[PDB]
Amino acid sequence: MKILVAVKQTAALEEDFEIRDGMDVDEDFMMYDLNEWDDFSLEEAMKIKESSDDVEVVVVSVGPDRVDESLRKCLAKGADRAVRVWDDAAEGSDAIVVGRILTEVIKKEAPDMVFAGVQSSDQAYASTGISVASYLNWPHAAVVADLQYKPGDNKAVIRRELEGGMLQEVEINCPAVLTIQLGINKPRYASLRGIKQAATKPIEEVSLADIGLSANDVGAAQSMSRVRRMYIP
Amino acid sequence: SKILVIAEHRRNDLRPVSLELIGAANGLKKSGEDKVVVAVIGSQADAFVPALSVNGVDELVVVKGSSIDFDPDVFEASVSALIAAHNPSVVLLPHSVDSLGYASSLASKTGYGFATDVYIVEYQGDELVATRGGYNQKVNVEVDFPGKSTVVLTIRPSVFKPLEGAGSPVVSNVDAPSVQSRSQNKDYV
Amino acid sequence: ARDPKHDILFEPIQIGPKTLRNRFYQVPHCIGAGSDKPGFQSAHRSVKAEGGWAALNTEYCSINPESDDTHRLSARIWDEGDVRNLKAMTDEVHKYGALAGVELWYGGAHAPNMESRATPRGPSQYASEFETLSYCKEMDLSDIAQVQQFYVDAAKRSRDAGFDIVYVYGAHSYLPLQFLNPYYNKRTDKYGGSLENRARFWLETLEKVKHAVGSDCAIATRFGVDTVYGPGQIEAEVDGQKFVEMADSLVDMWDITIGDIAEWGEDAGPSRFYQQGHTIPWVKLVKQVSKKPVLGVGRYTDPEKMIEIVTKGYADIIGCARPSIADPFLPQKVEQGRYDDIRVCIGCNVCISRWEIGGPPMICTQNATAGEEYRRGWHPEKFRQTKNKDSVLIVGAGPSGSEAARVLMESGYTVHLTDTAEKIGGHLNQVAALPGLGEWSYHRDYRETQITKLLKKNKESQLALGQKPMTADDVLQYGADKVIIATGARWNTDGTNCLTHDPIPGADASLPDQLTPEQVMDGKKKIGKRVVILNADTYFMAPSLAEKLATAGHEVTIVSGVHLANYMHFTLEYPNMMRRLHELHVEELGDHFCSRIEPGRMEIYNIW
Ligand SMILES: *c1c(C)c(C)cc2c1nc1c(=O)[nH]c(=O)nc-1n2C[C@H](O)[C@H](O)[C@H](O)COP(=O)(O)O
Ligand SMILES: Nc1ncnc2c1ncn2[C@@H]1O[C@H](COP(=O)(O)O)[C@@H](O)[C@H]1O
Ligand code: SF4
C-alpha cells in the first residue's frame, strides 16, 4: 500500500525586493522553503501509516536542484522516499503543466492515495492538485479538513471546510486525489538525530523521458496563461 | 459573444458573490449585443430563479443534478456541459471552496485559459487581461490568454460591485448528465 | 527602507554653539558608573554614540563633596582625577561623532553625604523628605556665592574634560529647584518670595555658568516645570512657564520633566501606570513660551509617536532615557528602517532598581549587555560567530532559553528551540496578563520576532512549540551537540517560604479553597468571596494579584510576613501601587506570618 504526497518548494521574498525585464522579481530577494500546506499533508499520511500494520509514504516534487532541500525535510518529517522530477525545459511550467508532469510520475509510482496541498504559499493557484486529478481521472475533493481512511478502503469520508467555517461531509471513492487544508493535524518536527539520518537517504531523480514526456510537453510554452507583467502595486 | 457565470448556493440560499460575478461579467462585456448567461446547478436549482432574475442576466440556465448542494463530479460535468453548448469567451466562477474542487479540472482537460483568485480584469484590444497576486500577495501579477477562445476565471469575492434592480432573463431548464458522483454529501456541522 | 515620514528625525539642530546631528538624545541618567567606573561609563554611552544617538550625557554629576550621594552612586567632577576618568567617555563619544554632556548637580539636603561627611547647604534649613535624616545648613549670602562658584568651578572642569554640553540640573527637586520652590524656600530676603526672588538663584547660576564656558559649550538646563503635587509646589501654568520665560535667554536647550525626587516615578513612568508620551500635556506647555530647542522624555520608543510630537511642535528633539538602555542602537535602526529589530523598553524599571538600592550596577530586562559592555565586552549588536558546525538543543522558550537561542543563532549556531507551551515566553505570558503589565509582553514579543527572523537565516535551526514535554530520553537521543535546559520555576505549592524554609502545615493547593498565582492566573479554578493572599514575597506578585482579585470584586486581605512590595519601592512603582490598593479597599496585615491552614481557616502570628 502506498500514499503519494505531492510537495512544493515555494519562494518568499525579502523586504524590499525589486522587480527584474518586468516579468518576475529579482532572484536574490528569494528564499525557498517547503510550502506550508504540505506540512499538513505529509503528516495526514504519516497519520495513516502509523494507524495500521504497511504504508509507503512517498513525496514527489517537480523542480530544480534546490528542492532537494525540501524533500529531505520531508524525509525527516516522515516520508519513506522522495522523488524529484526535472529537466530544464520544465522552466515555468504552470499549475496545469505541473499536474500533468505529476500525473506521469503518479502512474509509474501507482499509489492508492494522492495528497496535494490546498494552495501554494507563493502563487496560490489552488489548481495543482485538482489538475493532477483530472489528468489521472480520479475522484477528487478540495479543501480537506478531515480524513477517515484506513488502508485499502474503496471508500473514504472527508470534510470540506467551507467559507466562514461550516464543514461538509463527503464520502469519496478511492483511490482519490485530495487537497489538504490547514489545521488538519499538528505536523510533527524533526529531531536533529532525525534530520541527521535523512541526510543519508537518496533523493531519486526522475527525468522527463523516464515519465514519457518531452521538452515539447512542458514549460511556459504549454501553459495556460502567459505572463504579461509583474509590478509592486 | 457570451460570458458564462456559475452562481453558487448552499442550504437553500443564494450566495452574494453570485451577484458580484454578474456585475463583473457585465462590467467586462465588449459591446452591448454581447450576452450574459447565468447558470445555477441543483436538484432544486429553480428555487433560485427569482433572485438571479436581476439586472445584467440575459439568460438563466437551471441545471438539475443528483445532489442538492455542491458536488464536483456533477458540477464539472455540468459546466463543460454549459460551455460546450453556449461557446462563451469567458467563464466566471467565484473563487470559493466549492470552486477549488473543480475549476481546475475543467482547465486541465481542455486547455482553456485559466486563472484564479483574480481581482483584476480588463479588455486591451480584444486581449483579456486578469491580474493575480504573487508571493503571498506581495506583487500583482498580470497575465493573458494567447489564442485561448475560452477563458476560465475564479474571481476574488467582494471585489466586483453588483448591479441594482430586477431583470428579464430568458429562463431555460436542462438536465445534468445522469453520471454517478464518486462522492456523497451527508450533513453540514 | 526608512519610511520617509521619519526623515524628520534625522535633521540636525542648533543648540547654542553646538550642533546635534539628529533628534535622538540620551538625557542624563545613572547607570552605576559615575566617575568611578570609567571603563563602564565610556563603553556604555559610546555604543549609543556608535548607535547614533546625537548626544550622550553622564548621570547626575556632583560639583563638590558636600553633595555626595553615597550610598547611591552619582558621578563626580570634584578634581583632576575626575576630569581624567570622565574624559575617557568624552573621547569615546567623540570618536563616533556625537556629543558628550555632563549634568552639573548639587542636591542640598537630598544628598546624604555618607562618604564625604560634610554638611549640605540649602535655601532654607530643612530635612529631606527622602533621606529623612539628612538636614541642610541655611545659606546666608556668602553661602550663596561660594556654592555658585562651585558649579563654575565644575563647569570649567567639565570643558577640560571635553564635554560639549553642560547643564544646570534643576530637576528632581535638587538645589536650583529648591530655591524656586516654596516647599523648600522659606527665605524672606531677596532670594525668596517673589517669583524673581525664587529664580534668582538659578538665574544667577545659569549666567555664571554661561559666562564660564558659554562660548565653547552649550548650556542646557533641565527643569521640572510641574511637580505634579499641585498648589504649593511648581505648577506648569503658575511658576513653570514664567520661569521658562525668565531663563530663556540663558538656556541653549530646555530639557523638560515633571516630578520631585521622592516620587520621581512620575518622571520615570512605570509602564504599570503610565504609557508613552505620558508627560506630554505638561511637556507641551514649554514650547508655548520658549523660543529655544525643547526635549522632554516620555518613554519614547516609537518613531511614529516621535514624529507626532515634533510635527505638532511639542518638542524639537527626542529625549530618551530608558529606551536608550533597552536599545543603544534604536536610532540606526530607525534610520535604517529596521523597525522589527528594535528592542522595546518595557518600563519595568529594574534598571532604576539597582542604582536606587545604592551601589550595584544597572542591569536591564531587555538589554542583557547593559552593564556588560566594558567588563564582559559584550556588544549589543555584534556577536562572536562560531567556527564549528555544533548544534544546541534548548528546552523551554522563556526569557532564559529564548535569549539563549536568540544569541546563539545570532552567533551562527544550529539551534532547535522547543517548549510545551504554544507561544514564546515562558511564564512572561501570564505575567503580562496581570493588570498593568501589559507592556511587559514586549519582552517575548521581541524574542518571537527575532527567532522567527533568525530561522530563515539559519537553515538547520528549528522552532517547535506545542510539543510533548521532552524527556531525558528524547534529550539524550536528540542529537544536539549541546543542551540548554531552561525549564522554569513554579510558585510553591506547599507554603514553603523564606521564613521557615519549610512547608506551612495544611498548605496544599490541590485543595478547593487554596490557590497558587498560576491557578489564579489561568482563570479556571473557582475563587471565594473572601480572599486572603499569604505573602512571603517582596516583589510584584502579591500586590498585583491583590489588584486583580479586588477589581474582580472579591474582599481582599494580604497577610505579609515580609515588607510588602519592597522591591517596588525601588522601581518607583510603590506610591501608585499603594494608592491603588487603598482605592480598591485592599486590606493589609503586616508583620504577620501563618502557622497552620485548615479549610476556611488559617492561624496567623505577629513576628514581633
Ligand atoms: C537613573 C536611572 C537608571 C534611570 C533610568 C533614570 C535616571 C537615572 N539617573 C538620572 C540622573 O542622573 N539625573 C537625571 O537628570 N535623570 C536621571 N534619570 C531619569 C531620565 O533622565 C528620565 O527623565 C526618565 O527616565 C524618564 O524618561 P524615559 O526614560 O521614559 O525616556
Ligand atoms: N511543482 C510541484 N511539485 C509537486 N507538488 C506541487 C507542485 N506545484 C504545486 N504542487 C502541489 O500543489 C499543492 C497546492 O498548490 P497550488 O495549486 O499550487 O496552490 C502544493 O502543496 C503541492 O501539493
Ligand atoms: S530595565 Fe526595563 S524599563 Fe529599564 S531600560 Fe530596561 S527594559 Fe527598559
PDB file of C-alpha atoms in Angstrom, chain C residues 434-511:
ATOM      1  CA  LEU C 434      -1.625  40.887  35.356  1.00  0.00           C
ATOM      2  CA  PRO C 435      -3.373  44.259  35.494  1.00  0.00           C
ATOM      3  CA  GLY C 436      -0.918  46.998  34.141  1.00  0.00           C
ATOM      4  CA  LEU C 437       1.897  44.735  32.936  1.00  0.00           C
ATOM      5  CA  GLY C 438       0.634  44.570  29.517  1.00  0.00           C
ATOM      6  CA  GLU C 439       3.644  46.291  28.151  1.00  0.00           C
ATOM      7  CA  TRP C 440       5.994  43.564  29.621  1.00  0.00           C
ATOM      8  CA  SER C 441       4.862  41.278  26.749  1.00  0.00           C
ATOM      9  CA  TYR C 442       7.265  43.208  24.685  1.00  0.00           C
ATOM     10  CA  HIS C 443       9.955  41.026  26.053  1.00  0.00           C
ATOM     11  CA  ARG C 444       8.754  37.877  24.405  1.00  0.00           C
ATOM     12  CA  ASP C 445       7.403  39.947  21.571  1.00  0.00           C
ATOM     13  CA  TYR C 446      10.865  40.967  20.597  1.00  0.00           C
ATOM     14  CA  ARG C 447      12.145  37.423  21.030  1.00  0.00           C
ATOM     15  CA  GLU C 448       9.417  35.849  18.935  1.00  0.00           C
ATOM     16  CA  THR C 449      10.149  38.365  16.273  1.00  0.00           C
ATOM     17  CA  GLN C 450      13.895  37.771  16.084  1.00  0.00           C
ATOM     18  CA  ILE C 451      13.906  33.984  16.472  1.00  0.00           C
ATOM     19  CA  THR C 452      11.417  33.846  13.598  1.00  0.00           C
ATOM     20  CA  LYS C 453      13.916  36.061  11.655  1.00  0.00           C
ATOM     21  CA  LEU C 454      16.865  34.081  12.767  1.00  0.00           C
ATOM     22  CA  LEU C 455      15.311  30.814  11.484  1.00  0.00           C
ATOM     23  CA  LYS C 456      15.115  31.928   7.821  1.00  0.00           C
ATOM     24  CA  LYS C 457      18.827  32.776   8.214  1.00  0.00           C
ATOM     25  CA  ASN C 458      19.949  29.530   9.749  1.00  0.00           C
ATOM     26  CA  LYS C 459      18.663  26.789   7.639  1.00  0.00           C
ATOM     27  CA  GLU C 460      19.076  23.785  10.162  1.00  0.00           C
ATOM     28  CA  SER C 461      17.872  25.853  13.044  1.00  0.00           C
ATOM     29  CA  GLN C 462      14.252  24.948  14.335  1.00  0.00           C
ATOM     30  CA  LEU C 463      11.257  26.318  16.398  1.00  0.00           C
ATOM     31  CA  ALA C 464       8.843  23.839  17.857  1.00  0.00           C
ATOM     32  CA  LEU C 465       6.010  24.887  20.133  1.00  0.00           C
ATOM     33  CA  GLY C 466       3.072  22.827  21.125  1.00  0.00           C
ATOM     34  CA  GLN C 467       5.317  19.882  21.758  1.00  0.00           C
ATOM     35  CA  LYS C 468       5.199  16.984  24.105  1.00  0.00           C
ATOM     36  CA  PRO C 469       7.224  17.827  27.106  1.00  0.00           C
ATOM     37  CA  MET C 470      10.706  16.474  26.451  1.00  0.00           C
ATOM     38  CA  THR C 471      12.036  13.533  28.376  1.00  0.00           C
ATOM     39  CA  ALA C 472      15.504  12.782  29.166  1.00  0.00           C
ATOM     40  CA  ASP C 473      15.420  10.005  26.758  1.00  0.00           C
ATOM     41  CA  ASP C 474      14.205  12.339  23.958  1.00  0.00           C
ATOM     42  CA  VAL C 475      17.038  14.541  25.010  1.00  0.00           C
ATOM     43  CA  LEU C 476      19.939  12.103  25.097  1.00  0.00           C
ATOM     44  CA  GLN C 477      18.681  10.730  21.780  1.00  0.00           C
ATOM     45  CA  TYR C 478      18.125  14.282  20.338  1.00  0.00           C
ATOM     46  CA  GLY C 479      21.376  14.806  18.614  1.00  0.00           C
ATOM     47  CA  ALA C 480      22.202  18.264  19.672  1.00  0.00           C
ATOM     48  CA  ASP C 481      25.804  18.584  20.361  1.00  0.00           C
ATOM     49  CA  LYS C 482      24.915  20.662  23.299  1.00  0.00           C
ATOM     50  CA  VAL C 483      21.788  21.003  25.501  1.00  0.00           C
ATOM     51  CA  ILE C 484      20.360  24.008  27.446  1.00  0.00           C
ATOM     52  CA  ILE C 485      17.552  23.105  29.855  1.00  0.00           C
ATOM     53  CA  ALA C 486      15.561  26.206  30.583  1.00  0.00           C
ATOM     54  CA  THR C 487      12.532  24.742  32.103  1.00  0.00           C
ATOM     55  CA  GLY C 488      11.473  27.258  34.664  1.00  0.00           C
ATOM     56  CA  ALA C 489      10.235  27.533  38.218  1.00  0.00           C
ATOM     57  CA  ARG C 490       6.707  27.413  39.639  1.00  0.00           C
ATOM     58  CA  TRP C 491       5.120  29.047  42.629  1.00  0.00           C
ATOM     59  CA  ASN C 492       5.470  26.943  45.696  1.00  0.00           C
ATOM     60  CA  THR C 493       2.530  24.658  46.371  1.00  0.00           C
ATOM     61  CA  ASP C 494       3.019  23.965  49.961  1.00  0.00           C
ATOM     62  CA  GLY C 495       3.511  27.111  51.952  1.00  0.00           C
ATOM     63  CA  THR C 496       7.315  26.767  51.621  1.00  0.00           C
ATOM     64  CA  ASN C 497       8.822  30.221  52.380  1.00  0.00           C
ATOM     65  CA  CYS C 498      11.831  32.345  53.042  1.00  0.00           C
ATOM     66  CA  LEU C 499      10.979  32.496  56.972  1.00  0.00           C
ATOM     67  CA  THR C 500      10.706  28.801  57.955  1.00  0.00           C
ATOM     68  CA  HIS C 501      12.091  27.230  54.707  1.00  0.00           C
ATOM     69  CA  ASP C 502       9.614  24.508  55.353  1.00  0.00           C
ATOM     70  CA  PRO C 503       6.003  23.879  54.374  1.00  0.00           C
ATOM     71  CA  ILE C 504       3.077  25.501  56.320  1.00  0.00           C
ATOM     72  CA  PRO C 505       1.135  22.579  57.740  1.00  0.00           C
ATOM     73  CA  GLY C 506      -2.266  22.406  55.957  1.00  0.00           C
ATOM     74  CA  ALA C 507      -0.999  24.316  52.922  1.00  0.00           C
ATOM     75  CA  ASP C 508      -1.558  22.451  49.679  1.00  0.00           C
ATOM     76  CA  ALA C 509      -3.178  23.916  46.500  1.00  0.00           C
ATOM     77  CA  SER C 510      -4.740  20.871  45.128  1.00  0.00           C
ATOM     78  CA  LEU C 511      -7.447  21.596  47.859  1.00  0.00           C
TER      79      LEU C 511
END
